[PDB]
Amino acid sequence: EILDITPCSFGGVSVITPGTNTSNQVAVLYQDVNCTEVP
């Protein structure tokens, strides 16, 4: 049986954050990825 091999999702991680004197809360962006495959 013929099977196709595709590498699973990988991509850069970016941290969106206001300056530390403003707040410590951050957000994370996973480039070019299903939101369903993050965990």
């Binding site: 590498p7 991509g11 850069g12 480039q31 070019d32």
Partner: peptide
């Protein structure tokens, strides 16, 4: 007219074509 893995990644532009048109 203009129509045309191993760590490669293509980042989308900050301004979409719609915003440039606007």
């Amino acid at each position: 007219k203009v129509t045309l893995f191993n760590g490669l990644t293509v980042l989308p532009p900050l301004l979409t074509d719609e915003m440039i048109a606007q």
